[PDB]
Amino acid sequence: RVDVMDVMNRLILAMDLMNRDDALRVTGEVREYIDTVKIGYPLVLSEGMDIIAEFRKRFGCRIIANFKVADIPETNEKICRATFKAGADAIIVHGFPGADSVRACLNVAEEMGREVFLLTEMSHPGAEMFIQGAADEIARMGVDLGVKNYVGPRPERLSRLREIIGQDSFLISPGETLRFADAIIVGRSIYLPAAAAAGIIESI
Amino acid sequence: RVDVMDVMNRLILAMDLMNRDDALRVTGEVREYIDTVKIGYPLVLSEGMDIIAEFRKRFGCRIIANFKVADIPETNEKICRATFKAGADAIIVHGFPGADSVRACLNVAEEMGREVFLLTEMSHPGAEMFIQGAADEIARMGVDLGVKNYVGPRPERLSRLREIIGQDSFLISPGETLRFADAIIVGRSIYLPAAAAAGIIESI
């Protein structure tokens, strides 16, 4: 889809390391295979938001801030603005706090020409308590709001999500997977690199 | 209660300003009335996590990180560790992601001698979609996990929460309020200062 983000080799690196030196080393070593990196709070809180621009300048990669924003509208707006000002191309937002909280993020993304990814579901143990049961409705909420980028969770769940958001929407998830998702997210299998990344790409 | 945090004058300052200069000015001007300050991502992402230690050193105040942690266990652990390493006395965590995600935070707080506050409910418009209906269960989940600190949201809702967590638990919320909550959180009425704070205290 021309209107959606193009992820090199359909492979997104989940850079969850907290040490700047280690984070930079791994990412640089795989830049020939990946152009999209997902960074979270562990690294940013430990090294500072300036690390986002560093990644973009040193490697020319797209940065997705895996912040899972889940605050009230006004605060969500501020978090998004600060994150986009720091250079992030996109931000991941929780849907459980409701539509207004998601729209607050969409508004800033609109004004700054950036992107919002809606996290529809999580797959860790405790996710079955409240998240699993709200996943479909959260995905539908996103669709009704015009959200075009989604982060999905179980093969059959990914299939259900794709059904709700349509064939046009951009979907990323951590052979089978790429039948529904537009790009796969890989972490440890890489940063824990160039050979590993090359293998995964060759595998798909 | 001796085993719970003592908040000076039962008044917590919600420092939501994103400018370091403005944030420091207001807090210093009310330190003779307040010893507990709640800081969130807007300020921290914009000025850096080092601002937490700055607040504690310049004013000798307790800092509650209003991060509303809502990630998977491993990431929650890292966020809490980084936040406590930066000097935060306590951190606010979401309950919607489930018990394991909350316990991950409790584990780090236990190891570092810090505190975890469970956010049981939010009051912004979109909160009725998913949060309102899970509030009671989230509060009960916290109780069953030994959580001792809670952040509450409607007067009658505060009464319901206090009922679930017991009379011993520490509860903070944004006269009537202090009938159920141990301390009230005030933001704009102060940072938007010394006179305002003094009035609120003299009020209660």
Tab-separated table of C-alpha atoms in Angstrom:
chain	number	residue	atom	x	y	z
A	1	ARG	CA	0.000	0.000	0.000
A	2	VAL	CA	1.489	3.305	-1.171
A	3	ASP	CA	-0.157	5.305	1.626
A	4	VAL	CA	1.438	3.152	4.317
A	5	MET	CA	4.919	3.006	5.795
A	6	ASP	CA	7.490	0.938	3.880
A	7	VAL	CA	9.552	-1.233	6.231
A	8	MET	CA	12.764	-2.505	4.663
A	9	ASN	CA	12.660	-6.294	4.291
A	10	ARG	CA	9.453	-6.352	6.363
A	11	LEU	CA	11.667	-6.695	9.447
A	12	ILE	CA	11.541	-4.324	12.419
A	13	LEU	CA	14.260	-4.434	15.059
A	14	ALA	CA	13.013	-4.277	18.631
A	15	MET	CA	15.945	-2.516	20.295
A	16	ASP	CA	15.190	-3.178	23.957
A	17	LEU	CA	18.753	-2.838	25.261
A	18	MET	CA	19.204	-0.168	27.939
A	19	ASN	CA	22.863	0.625	27.305
A	20	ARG	CA	23.564	3.267	24.659
A	21	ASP	CA	26.842	1.697	23.527
A	22	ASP	CA	25.270	-1.736	23.095
A	23	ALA	CA	22.124	-0.326	21.485
A	24	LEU	CA	24.066	1.700	18.913
A	25	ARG	CA	26.487	-1.113	18.087
A	26	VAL	CA	23.770	-3.648	17.264
A	27	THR	CA	21.591	-1.265	15.253
A	28	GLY	CA	24.493	-0.059	13.132
A	29	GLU	CA	25.520	-3.638	12.415
A	30	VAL	CA	22.091	-4.444	10.960
A	31	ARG	CA	21.251	-1.191	9.155
A	32	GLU	CA	22.017	-2.812	5.799
A	33	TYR	CA	19.067	-5.131	6.430
A	34	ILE	CA	16.687	-3.018	8.518
A	35	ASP	CA	15.551	0.606	8.277
A	36	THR	CA	12.960	0.569	11.073
A	37	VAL	CA	13.791	0.399	14.783
A	38	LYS	CA	11.416	0.239	17.752
A	39	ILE	CA	12.800	1.889	20.907
A	40	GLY	CA	11.139	1.863	24.316
A	41	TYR	CA	11.288	3.592	27.676
A	42	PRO	CA	14.106	1.420	29.096
A	43	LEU	CA	16.614	2.924	26.669
A	44	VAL	CA	15.137	6.429	26.523
A	45	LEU	CA	14.770	6.888	30.284
A	46	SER	CA	18.275	5.536	30.859
A	47	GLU	CA	20.079	7.461	28.115
A	48	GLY	CA	17.757	10.363	27.342
A	49	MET	CA	15.371	11.224	24.517
A	50	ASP	CA	18.284	12.634	22.524
A	51	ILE	CA	19.136	9.031	21.647
A	52	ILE	CA	16.229	9.002	19.167
A	53	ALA	CA	17.827	11.634	16.946
A	54	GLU	CA	21.175	9.864	17.345
A	55	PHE	CA	19.717	6.668	15.899
A	56	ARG	CA	18.163	8.549	12.988
A	57	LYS	CA	21.318	10.507	12.168
A	58	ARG	CA	23.860	7.729	12.639
A	59	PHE	CA	21.840	5.114	10.760
A	60	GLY	CA	19.139	6.945	8.819
A	61	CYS	CA	16.536	4.628	10.292
A	62	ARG	CA	12.893	5.234	11.080
A	63	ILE	CA	12.180	5.223	14.829
A	64	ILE	CA	8.984	3.911	16.386
A	65	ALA	CA	8.651	4.931	20.038
A	66	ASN	CA	7.259	1.911	21.891
A	67	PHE	CA	5.904	3.999	24.743
A	68	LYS	CA	2.425	2.447	24.933
A	69	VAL	CA	0.963	5.844	25.830
A	70	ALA	CA	-1.899	5.357	28.293
A	71	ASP	CA	-2.697	8.660	29.969
A	72	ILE	CA	-5.464	11.269	29.829
A	73	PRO	CA	-5.894	13.278	26.603
A	74	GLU	CA	-3.936	16.366	27.669
A	75	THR	CA	-0.983	14.351	28.903
A	76	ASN	CA	-1.076	12.053	25.869
A	77	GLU	CA	-0.862	15.166	23.696
A	78	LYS	CA	2.225	16.376	25.568
A	79	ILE	CA	3.939	12.981	25.491
A	80	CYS	CA	3.379	12.688	21.742
A	81	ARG	CA	4.555	16.240	21.081
A	82	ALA	CA	7.733	15.724	23.121
A	83	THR	CA	8.398	12.382	21.440
A	84	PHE	CA	7.848	13.704	17.903
A	85	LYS	CA	9.916	16.809	18.702
A	86	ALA	CA	12.720	14.404	19.666
A	87	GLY	CA	12.480	12.974	16.154
A	88	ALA	CA	10.315	9.871	16.468
A	89	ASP	CA	8.575	8.928	13.231
A	90	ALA	CA	5.821	7.073	15.063
A	91	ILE	CA	4.512	6.281	18.528
A	92	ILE	CA	2.671	3.239	19.922
A	93	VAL	CA	-0.430	4.041	21.957
A	94	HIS	CA	-2.696	1.977	24.205
A	95	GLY	CA	-6.358	1.795	23.335
A	96	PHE	CA	-7.774	0.753	26.703
A	97	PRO	CA	-7.948	4.338	28.043
A	98	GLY	CA	-10.543	5.101	25.355
A	99	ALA	CA	-11.167	7.027	22.161
A	100	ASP	CA	-10.428	10.544	23.392
A	101	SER	CA	-7.014	9.459	24.651
A	102	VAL	CA	-6.233	7.936	21.264
A	103	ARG	CA	-7.534	10.953	19.341
A	104	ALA	CA	-5.280	13.252	21.383
A	105	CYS	CA	-2.338	11.333	19.936
A	106	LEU	CA	-3.804	11.379	16.428
A	107	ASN	CA	-4.188	15.161	16.644
A	108	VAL	CA	-0.506	15.740	17.362
A	109	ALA	CA	0.546	13.215	14.725
A	110	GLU	CA	-1.651	15.114	12.256
A	111	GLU	CA	-0.117	18.487	13.117
A	112	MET	CA	3.457	17.195	12.972
A	113	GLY	CA	3.143	14.781	10.068
A	114	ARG	CA	3.950	11.684	12.112
A	115	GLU	CA	2.250	8.350	12.800
A	116	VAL	CA	0.292	6.679	15.578
A	117	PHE	CA	0.190	2.899	16.028
A	118	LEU	CA	-2.672	1.504	18.090
A	119	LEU	CA	-1.768	-1.402	20.375
A	120	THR	CA	-4.840	-3.621	20.207
A	121	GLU	CA	-3.682	-6.456	22.425
A	122	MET	CA	-0.816	-7.858	24.499
A	123	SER	CA	0.210	-11.503	24.888
A	124	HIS	CA	1.991	-11.706	28.243
A	125	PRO	CA	0.347	-13.870	30.956
A	126	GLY	CA	-1.778	-11.236	32.697
A	127	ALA	CA	-3.199	-9.967	29.403
A	128	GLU	CA	-6.129	-12.360	29.697
A	129	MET	CA	-7.471	-10.509	32.737
A	130	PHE	CA	-8.692	-7.367	30.940
A	131	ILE	CA	-6.861	-6.814	27.638
A	132	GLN	CA	-7.797	-9.984	25.751
A	133	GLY	CA	-11.510	-9.351	26.238
A	134	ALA	CA	-11.288	-5.761	25.006
A	135	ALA	CA	-9.001	-6.381	22.014
A	136	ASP	CA	-11.658	-6.655	19.308
A	137	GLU	CA	-13.521	-3.566	20.520
A	138	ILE	CA	-10.268	-1.596	20.775
A	139	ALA	CA	-9.381	-2.553	17.206
A	140	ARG	CA	-12.863	-1.520	16.061
A	141	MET	CA	-12.485	1.745	17.985
A	142	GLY	CA	-9.277	2.400	16.085
A	143	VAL	CA	-10.921	1.695	12.737
A	144	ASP	CA	-13.832	3.990	13.485
A	145	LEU	CA	-11.212	6.648	14.337
A	146	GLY	CA	-9.300	6.323	11.073
A	147	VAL	CA	-6.233	4.749	12.679
A	148	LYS	CA	-4.080	3.269	9.908
A	149	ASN	CA	-1.306	1.580	11.901
A	150	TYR	CA	-1.750	-1.259	14.379
A	151	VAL	CA	0.405	-3.439	16.598
A	152	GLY	CA	-0.988	-6.929	17.038
A	153	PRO	CA	-0.401	-9.726	19.591
A	154	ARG	CA	-1.475	-16.837	18.595
A	155	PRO	CA	-1.831	-16.947	14.767
A	156	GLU	CA	-5.640	-16.977	14.887
A	157	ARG	CA	-5.680	-13.724	16.869
A	158	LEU	CA	-3.602	-11.965	14.233
A	159	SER	CA	-6.090	-13.203	11.631
A	160	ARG	CA	-9.010	-11.777	13.602
A	161	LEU	CA	-7.279	-8.409	13.920
A	162	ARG	CA	-6.569	-8.201	10.186
A	163	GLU	CA	-10.253	-8.920	9.581
A	164	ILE	CA	-11.357	-6.030	11.793
A	165	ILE	CA	-8.909	-3.424	10.461
A	166	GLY	CA	-9.178	-4.354	6.788
A	167	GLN	CA	-6.630	-5.226	4.110
A	168	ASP	CA	-5.399	-1.637	3.730
A	169	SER	CA	-4.331	-0.937	7.334
A	170	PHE	CA	-0.672	-1.340	8.300
A	171	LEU	CA	-0.115	-4.121	10.844
A	172	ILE	CA	3.079	-5.119	12.627
A	173	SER	CA	3.551	-8.061	14.992
A	174	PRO	CA	6.360	-9.804	16.920
A	175	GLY	CA	5.983	-17.314	7.270
A	176	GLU	CA	2.670	-17.553	9.117
A	177	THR	CA	2.893	-14.083	10.669
A	178	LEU	CA	3.561	-12.280	7.378
A	179	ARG	CA	0.360	-13.726	5.952
A	180	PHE	CA	-1.535	-11.230	8.092
A	181	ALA	CA	1.050	-8.692	9.269
A	182	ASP	CA	2.886	-6.336	6.915
A	183	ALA	CA	6.080	-6.578	8.957
A	184	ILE	CA	7.468	-8.718	11.766
A	185	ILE	CA	9.163	-7.391	14.890
A	186	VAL	CA	12.276	-9.235	16.051
A	187	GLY	CA	14.268	-8.503	19.180
A	188	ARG	CA	16.444	-10.949	21.127
A	189	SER	CA	17.010	-13.178	18.095
A	190	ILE	CA	19.091	-10.249	16.835
A	191	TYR	CA	20.487	-7.999	19.577
A	192	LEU	CA	21.240	-10.972	21.824
A	193	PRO	CA	23.569	-9.595	14.830
A	194	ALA	CA	24.151	-8.960	11.124
A	195	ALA	CA	24.145	-12.694	10.401
A	196	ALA	CA	20.982	-13.287	12.433
A	197	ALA	CA	19.148	-10.494	10.623
A	198	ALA	CA	20.329	-11.735	7.229
A	199	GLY	CA	19.055	-15.201	8.087
A	200	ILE	CA	15.576	-14.046	9.082
A	201	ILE	CA	15.238	-12.026	5.879
A	202	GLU	CA	16.405	-14.985	3.805
A	203	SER	CA	13.909	-17.075	5.772
A	204	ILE	CA	11.094	-14.886	4.446
B	1	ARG	CA	-0.903	4.752	59.645
B	2	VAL	CA	2.759	4.335	60.615
B	3	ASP	CA	3.487	1.870	57.800
B	4	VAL	CA	2.292	4.258	55.092
B	5	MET	CA	3.828	7.318	53.478
B	6	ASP	CA	3.341	10.607	55.339
B	7	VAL	CA	2.388	13.397	52.938
B	8	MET	CA	2.904	16.866	54.386
B	9	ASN	CA	-0.433	18.632	54.867
B	10	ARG	CA	-2.141	15.812	52.949
B	11	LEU	CA	-1.493	17.819	49.776
B	12	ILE	CA	0.383	16.487	46.747
B	13	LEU	CA	1.499	18.850	44.003
B	14	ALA	CA	0.848	17.606	40.488
B	15	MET	CA	3.732	19.260	38.635
B	16	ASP	CA	2.664	18.849	35.019
B	17	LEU	CA	4.680	21.741	33.576
B	18	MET	CA	7.102	20.737	30.816
B	19	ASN	CA	9.540	23.607	31.283
B	20	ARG	CA	12.311	22.931	33.803
B	21	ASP	CA	12.601	26.584	34.832
B	22	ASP	CA	8.873	26.932	35.465
B	23	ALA	CA	8.653	23.532	37.163
B	24	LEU	CA	11.489	24.273	39.595
B	25	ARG	CA	10.217	27.767	40.389
B	26	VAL	CA	6.707	26.671	41.375
B	27	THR	CA	7.841	23.669	43.418
B	28	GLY	CA	10.380	25.695	45.374
B	29	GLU	CA	7.783	28.353	46.125
B	30	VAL	CA	5.479	25.805	47.783
B	31	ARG	CA	8.003	23.534	49.512
B	32	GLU	CA	7.142	24.996	52.917
B	33	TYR	CA	3.627	23.613	52.434
B	34	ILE	CA	4.203	20.459	50.378
B	35	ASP	CA	6.813	17.701	50.577
B	36	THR	CA	5.416	15.371	47.911
B	37	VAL	CA	5.477	16.081	44.181
B	38	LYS	CA	4.051	14.015	41.322
B	39	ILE	CA	5.997	14.357	38.055
B	40	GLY	CA	5.068	12.794	34.731
B	41	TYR	CA	6.496	12.009	31.322
B	42	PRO	CA	5.930	15.476	29.814
B	43	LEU	CA	8.535	17.012	32.119
B	44	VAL	CA	10.871	14.010	32.243
B	45	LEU	CA	10.937	13.360	28.492
B	46	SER	CA	11.454	17.058	27.785
B	47	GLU	CA	14.140	17.743	30.396
B	48	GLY	CA	15.580	14.317	31.176
B	49	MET	CA	15.266	11.899	34.089
B	50	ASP	CA	17.992	13.794	35.943
B	51	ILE	CA	15.311	16.323	36.865
B	52	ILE	CA	13.988	13.866	39.459
B	53	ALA	CA	17.171	14.039	41.522
B	54	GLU	CA	17.224	17.812	41.034
B	55	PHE	CA	13.804	18.150	42.650
B	56	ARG	CA	14.789	15.951	45.586
B	57	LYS	CA	18.089	17.742	46.191
B	58	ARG	CA	16.888	21.310	45.696
B	59	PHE	CA	13.711	20.876	47.729
B	60	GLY	CA	14.060	17.670	49.729
B	61	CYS	CA	10.699	16.527	48.426
B	62	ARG	CA	9.414	13.025	47.800
B	63	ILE	CA	8.892	12.309	44.089
B	64	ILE	CA	6.119	10.134	42.695
B	65	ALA	CA	6.680	9.236	39.040
B	66	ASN	CA	3.286	9.468	37.329
B	67	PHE	CA	4.326	7.188	34.488
B	68	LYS	CA	1.246	4.929	34.489
B	69	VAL	CA	3.451	1.956	33.583
B	70	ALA	CA	1.528	-0.369	31.260
B	71	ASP	CA	3.938	-2.720	29.514
B	72	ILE	CA	4.862	-6.402	29.705
B	73	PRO	CA	6.542	-7.698	32.890
B	74	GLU	CA	10.150	-7.519	31.674
B	75	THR	CA	9.771	-3.982	30.377
B	76	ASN	CA	7.861	-2.850	33.468
B	77	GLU	CA	10.766	-4.151	35.545
B	78	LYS	CA	13.261	-2.116	33.508
B	79	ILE	CA	11.147	1.041	33.591
B	80	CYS	CA	10.787	0.801	37.365
B	81	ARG	CA	14.483	0.083	37.875
B	82	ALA	CA	15.502	3.054	35.725
B	83	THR	CA	12.983	5.319	37.447
B	84	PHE	CA	14.016	4.297	40.970
B	85	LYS	CA	17.701	4.535	39.989
B	86	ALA	CA	16.951	8.143	38.987
B	87	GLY	CA	15.723	8.749	42.524
B	88	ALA	CA	11.950	8.363	42.375
B	89	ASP	CA	10.435	7.388	45.715
B	90	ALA	CA	7.365	5.856	44.081
B	91	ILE	CA	5.903	5.027	40.687
B	92	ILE	CA	2.295	4.882	39.448
B	93	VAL	CA	1.377	1.748	37.523
B	94	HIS	CA	-1.635	0.703	35.450
B	95	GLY	CA	-3.555	-2.388	36.464
B	96	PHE	CA	-5.296	-3.106	33.136
B	97	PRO	CA	-2.304	-5.123	31.812
B	98	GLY	CA	-2.819	-7.698	34.568
B	99	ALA	CA	-1.293	-9.077	37.739
B	100	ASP	CA	2.069	-10.208	36.375
B	101	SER	CA	2.756	-6.735	34.988
B	102	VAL	CA	1.961	-5.225	38.374
B	103	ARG	CA	4.037	-7.783	40.278
B	104	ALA	CA	7.051	-7.014	38.077
B	105	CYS	CA	6.889	-3.474	39.453
B	106	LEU	CA	6.361	-4.673	43.023
B	107	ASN	CA	9.455	-6.873	42.731
B	108	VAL	CA	11.731	-3.966	41.834
B	109	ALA	CA	10.158	-1.750	44.497
B	110	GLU	CA	10.837	-4.516	47.029
B	111	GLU	CA	14.482	-4.870	45.978
B	112	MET	CA	15.133	-1.126	46.000
B	113	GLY	CA	13.018	-0.107	48.981
B	114	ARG	CA	10.611	2.038	46.972
B	115	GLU	CA	6.839	2.174	46.476
B	116	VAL	CA	4.299	1.223	43.835
B	117	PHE	CA	0.941	2.978	43.473
B	118	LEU	CA	-1.760	1.114	41.555
B	119	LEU	CA	-3.929	3.295	39.318
B	120	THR	CA	-7.361	1.719	39.680
B	121	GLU	CA	-9.350	4.040	37.453
B	122	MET	CA	-9.269	7.185	35.311
B	123	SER	CA	-11.948	9.870	34.993
B	124	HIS	CA	-11.438	11.399	31.547
B	125	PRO	CA	-14.275	10.930	29.012
B	126	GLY	CA	-13.015	7.798	27.265
B	127	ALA	CA	-12.510	6.001	30.584
B	128	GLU	CA	-16.046	4.608	30.462
B	129	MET	CA	-15.219	2.456	27.438
B	130	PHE	CA	-12.986	-0.082	29.217
B	131	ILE	CA	-11.468	1.315	32.427
B	132	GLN	CA	-14.608	2.107	34.424
B	133	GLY	CA	-15.904	-1.448	34.090
B	134	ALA	CA	-12.631	-2.993	35.249
B	135	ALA	CA	-11.911	-0.608	38.134
B	136	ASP	CA	-13.307	-2.729	40.959
B	137	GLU	CA	-11.589	-5.887	39.711
B	138	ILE	CA	-8.297	-4.034	39.284
B	139	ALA	CA	-8.551	-2.713	42.839
B	140	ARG	CA	-9.283	-6.223	44.125
B	141	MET	CA	-6.344	-7.539	42.094
B	142	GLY	CA	-4.119	-5.009	43.826
B	143	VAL	CA	-5.406	-6.002	47.259
B	144	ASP	CA	-4.840	-9.683	46.578
B	145	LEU	CA	-1.269	-8.769	45.540
B	146	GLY	CA	-0.513	-6.854	48.729
B	147	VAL	CA	-0.469	-3.446	47.038
B	148	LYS	CA	-0.544	-0.772	49.747
B	149	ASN	CA	-0.733	2.425	47.683
B	150	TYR	CA	-3.545	3.380	45.309
B	151	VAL	CA	-4.500	6.277	43.065
B	152	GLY	CA	-8.238	6.795	42.748
B	153	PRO	CA	-10.430	8.702	40.248
B	154	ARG	CA	-17.214	11.069	41.439
B	155	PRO	CA	-17.207	11.026	45.279
B	156	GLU	CA	-19.139	7.743	45.418
B	157	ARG	CA	-16.436	6.047	43.346
B	158	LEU	CA	-13.792	6.993	45.891
B	159	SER	CA	-15.998	5.452	48.584
B	160	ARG	CA	-16.249	2.207	46.619
B	161	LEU	CA	-12.477	2.075	46.162
B	162	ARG	CA	-11.805	2.715	49.854
B	163	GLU	CA	-14.183	-0.142	50.657
B	164	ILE	CA	-12.280	-2.582	48.443
B	165	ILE	CA	-8.761	-1.686	49.616
B	166	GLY	CA	-9.561	-1.365	53.314
B	167	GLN	CA	-8.971	1.382	55.866
B	168	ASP	CA	-5.237	0.656	56.112
B	169	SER	CA	-4.221	1.155	52.458
B	170	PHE	CA	-2.837	4.516	51.323
B	171	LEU	CA	-5.103	6.296	48.836
B	172	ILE	CA	-4.492	9.521	46.935
B	173	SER	CA	-6.937	11.322	44.638
B	174	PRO	CA	-7.184	14.580	42.646
B	175	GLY	CA	-13.255	18.378	52.158
B	176	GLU	CA	-15.260	15.411	50.889
B	177	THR	CA	-12.263	13.830	49.159
B	178	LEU	CA	-10.219	13.566	52.365
B	179	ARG	CA	-13.056	11.564	53.890
B	180	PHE	CA	-11.830	8.612	51.836
B	181	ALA	CA	-8.423	9.608	50.456
B	182	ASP	CA	-5.365	10.111	52.664
B	183	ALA	CA	-4.098	12.959	50.496
B	184	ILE	CA	-5.414	15.124	47.678
B	185	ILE	CA	-3.555	15.882	44.459
B	186	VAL	CA	-3.691	19.465	43.203
B	187	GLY	CA	-2.177	20.820	40.018
B	188	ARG	CA	-3.444	23.851	38.094
B	189	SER	CA	-4.924	25.551	41.152
B	190	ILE	CA	-1.286	25.893	42.224
B	191	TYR	CA	1.192	25.954	39.329
B	192	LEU	CA	-1.192	28.055	37.243
B	193	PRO	CA	1.596	29.576	43.892
B	194	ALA	CA	2.573	29.815	47.561
B	195	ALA	CA	-0.637	31.672	48.402
B	196	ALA	CA	-2.779	29.130	46.548
B	197	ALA	CA	-1.182	26.194	48.356
B	198	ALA	CA	-1.539	27.903	51.737
B	199	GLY	CA	-5.226	28.493	51.071
B	200	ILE	CA	-5.984	24.875	50.203
B	201	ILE	CA	-4.221	23.666	53.347
B	202	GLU	CA	-5.910	26.243	55.569
B	203	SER	CA	-9.140	25.142	53.899
B	204	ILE	CA	-8.950	21.503	54.989
